[PDB]
Structure formats: C-alpha cells, structure tokens
C-alpha cells in the first residue's frame, strides 16, 4: 500500500537544469521527513538531501549544497528534488526516500522508490561502431576459440548485442559498457567456439541501438596472425 | 561529515556459511545506524535499524549488533538469497553511507583462459586502433592485466570491463582494451598483454606482431 512513484530516465547538458519527482501515497505524508539518496554508475549509495515533514528545514551533502533544492508538496504528497548547475559527475540514479520513523531527527529508509537514472553529458545521439574481434592462432586455446565484437563510440546507452540472430547463446559475453574520455560509450562482445570449425562455421554478430534507429549485422571471419 | 568504513569492501561466501560484516564510524553514534541489502537493477531494502532491530518480514537468520564506533552485521547461514551487496548508514548527524560490502559467490580457483585480438582493418581505416585482451571463465575476480609494447609498460591507456559473477559456473571474465591512434599504433611490432593470477601455475602473455597480424 506504501507505494513512491517515480519518473524515468532524462539527459541533461551540463550546466542545466532539472527537477526530478516522487508520488508519495500509503502513509501520512507530511509525517515523514524525504530523502534524496543517489548511485553513481557501479558506486555506492550516497546521500543527497533531505526535508522535514512540513518543509521548514533542509539538509544537503556539501557536494550539491548550493546548486540542488528539496521540496514537497504535502497536498497532493510529491517530493521534489531541483538540480541546477549539473555536472557530469551528478550522473546517477536517484531514489525518494521515506523515513521510517515519524521522529524529528534520525533519518534512515524503511520505503524506497524504484530510482530515475539522470545522465548528464554534452554528447550528442550516436550509433556504434562495431569492429569485428577475428579468431586466430591468438584467440585459440587448444580446441576452443574466442572472437567477438567491437561496439563502440555509441551514446545513450543500451546497445544489444545477439549472436547468429539468437542461435548463439552458450559462451557468450557481453561485458559492461565504459565511458570513454569522450564521453561515448564503448563494450565488446565475445564468444567461445569449437577452433576446429572455424572454416565451416559462419559467426555474425546482430548489434542494435534503439536511440539511433542502428542494427547491424557483422560477419566475423578469422585472419592467419601468428 | 562522520565517515563509515566497511570491511571487507568483498566477502567470498559458500551457502551456509555464517557471514559477518563489520562497520567503523569516524566518532561515536551510540546506536543510530541502520543496514541496508541491495540486488542489480533493484532500490535498497532497510534489514536492521537502530544497530540491531530487525525490520518486519527480515527473516531471522540476518542479526545486527554493536555501537558507539563499531557494528556487525551477521547472517546465521547464507542463503542463495543473500548473495547481494549491504551497506550500513548513520543518523547520529547528517546521514551517511559506508562503501558496502559485496557477498559474492565462493567456488573453486579457475584459471583464465587469455586470448588476444589485433585491430581490425576497418577500424585501422577510422584513424583508431583497439587492441583487446579477453581473460575469459576465471575466479577469483582478482587478476593483473598488464600491456606492453615493444616491452615498453603501458600505463593508462587501456579501460577494462568485468562480468557480473556468471549464473552457471560462477566465474568472471574480464576484457582489457589499450586504445592508441592508427598513426601511433603503425610506430610499434609487438603488442602484448601479461596475465598474471592466482589460478595460473605462472604468467600468461598473449602477444602478436603488427605486420604478420
Ligand atoms: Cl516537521
Ligand atoms: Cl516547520
Ligand atoms: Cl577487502
Ligand atoms: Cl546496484
Ligand atoms: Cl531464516
Ligand atoms: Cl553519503
């Protein structure tokens, strides 16, 4: 029945301007003090802001203190968070945060929303690159060879990537996205094959990136090395 | 402002094991610290609050204990359940976060298996060039990727990238690109990348030549 309702992914440049929103029902709204609790990509929680019950204190991390702003509206039970000044490194999911008790002080979260990714970059739509990764004497071990595919210089993100149109499963591996210096996104995807029919086997990696309408289909092909 | 350490940062457990991470707080917060569990793609979940009350629906099996500048939080007997990260908070002043500690998936040492790409021609043609180094089906996380060139160490210039633990076997993979432009990739023969990890009896290193590559 406690339910924090929130909004969904949204680019911004830096040096812009957002508000982010949380609808709050199930509880006695103006009760508990809200949190603003934020992930960077592949770090840990870090606390934002918070408000009290009524809105007449506020507190903030000294590394938003003067560019964000809580609010709430204890009428229709919304929380708000106000970023200005946005910088590449505000780049997070952002969670509302309900206190679990009704006390003046002690904020700790007994209810979370579902987080809104917020990405802030001057980097404009792309579609990938995608460079094959050719099995060779190099990638081979034995019986087992490794190829795979290059997808990069992309922006937003995702990209997908299957093997022979889906009919490729088992051994592959699709690592994480990096942002590169850039500020485009980089991955490859690879897999492990029989090395003895690297000649009869045909091997096509199906990369697709919905933000710029891209689908590609590469062939992968060994080269001799050694 | 009061900072909080977790330790260990990653803690190796097999089901059944009885788990226990500690947290230290920069100056006393008597007992005002809560715990926190948190999966992939998923929002925390509140455990324990106040050092060792245990939240409603939290089974049993999680306990809290501690105050002033040192707690605990135990697991009984891990479960498939458990394998996530947590992380303790403060509310004495200002809330904070500990880093968190990640429970991860203990099984037996693999060794990686190292291949190692040359750039494509297509992308020699863009002006760049990405050489890959796959270490492919390994555990423990834990491994030194290192590039040479022309056995000049690189340093840098090269971003990896690793696998979530893997449903099946439970092993790792790890991707290592050194990135350079075309024209400066053309300076240099031999391109190598040295493994070394706890698996491997000795030093892997994958290398070619540019030119028979
Ligand atoms: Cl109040
Ligand atoms: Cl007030
Ligand atoms: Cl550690
Ligand atoms: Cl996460
Ligand atoms: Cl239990
Ligand atoms: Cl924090």
């Known amino acids: 029945q406690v339910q924090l309702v929130q909004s969904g992914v949204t680019l911004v440049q830096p040096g812009g301007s957002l508000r982010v929103s949380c609808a709050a029902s199930g509880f006695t709204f103006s009760s508990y003090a809200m949190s603003w609790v934020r992930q960077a990509p592949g770090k840990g929680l870090e606390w934002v802001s918070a408000i009290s019950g009524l809105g007449g204190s506020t507190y903030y991390a000294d590394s938003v203190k003067g560019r964000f702003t809580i609010s709430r509206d204890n009428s229709k039970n919304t929380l708000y968070l106000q970023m200005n000044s946005l910088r590449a490194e505000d780049t997070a999911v952002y969670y509302c945060?309900?206190?679990?008790?009704?006390?003046?002080?002690?904020?700790?979260?007994?209810?979370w929303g579902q987080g809104a990714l917020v990405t802030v970059s001057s980097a404009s739509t792309k579609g990938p690159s995608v460079f094959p990764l050719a099995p060779s004497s190099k990638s081979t071990s034995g019986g087992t060879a490794a190829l795979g595919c290059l997808v990069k210089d992309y922006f937003p993100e995702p990209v997908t990537v299957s093997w022979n149109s889906g009919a490729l499963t088992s051994g592959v591996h699709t690592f994480p996205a990096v942002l590169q210096s850039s500020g485009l996104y980089s991955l490859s995807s690879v897999v492990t094959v029989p090395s003895s029919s690297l000649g009869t086997q045909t091997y096509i990696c199906n990369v697709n990136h919905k933000p710029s309408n891209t689908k590609v289909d590469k062939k992968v092909e060994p080269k001799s090395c050694d | 402002d009061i900072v909080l350490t977790q330790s260990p940062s990653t803690l190796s457990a097999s089901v059944g094991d009885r788990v226990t991470i500690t947290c230290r707080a920069s100056?006393?917060?008597?007992?005002?610290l809560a715990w926190y569990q948190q999966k992939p793609g998923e929002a925390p979940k509140l455990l324990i609050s106040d050092a060792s009350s245990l939240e409603s629906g939290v089974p049993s099996r999680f306990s809290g204990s501690g105050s002033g500048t040192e707690f605990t939080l135990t697991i009984s007997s891990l479960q498939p359940d458990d394998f996530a990260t947590y992380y303790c908070?403060?509310?004495?002043?200002?809330?904070?976060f500990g880093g968190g500690t990640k429970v991860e998936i203990k099984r037996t040492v693999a060794a990686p298996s190292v291949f190692i790409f040359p750039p494509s021609d297509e992308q020699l043609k863009s002006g760049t060039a990405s050489v890959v180094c796959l270490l492919n089906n390994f555990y423990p996380r834990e491994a030194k990727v290192q590039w040479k060139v022309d056995n000049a160490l690189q340093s840098g210039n090269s971003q990896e990238s690793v696998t979530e633990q893997d449903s099946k076997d439970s092993t790792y993979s790890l991707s290592s690109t050194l990135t350079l432009s075309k024209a400066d990739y053309e300076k240099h023969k031999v391109y190598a990348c040295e493994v070394t990890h706890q698996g491997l009896r000795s030093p892997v290193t994958k290398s070619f030549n540019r030119g028979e590559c």
């Open positions: 100056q006393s917060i008597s007992s005002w």
């Open positions: 945060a309900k206190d679990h008790r009704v006390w003046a002080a002690g904020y700790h979260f007994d209810y």
């Open positions: 908070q403060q509310y004495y002043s200002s809330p904070i």
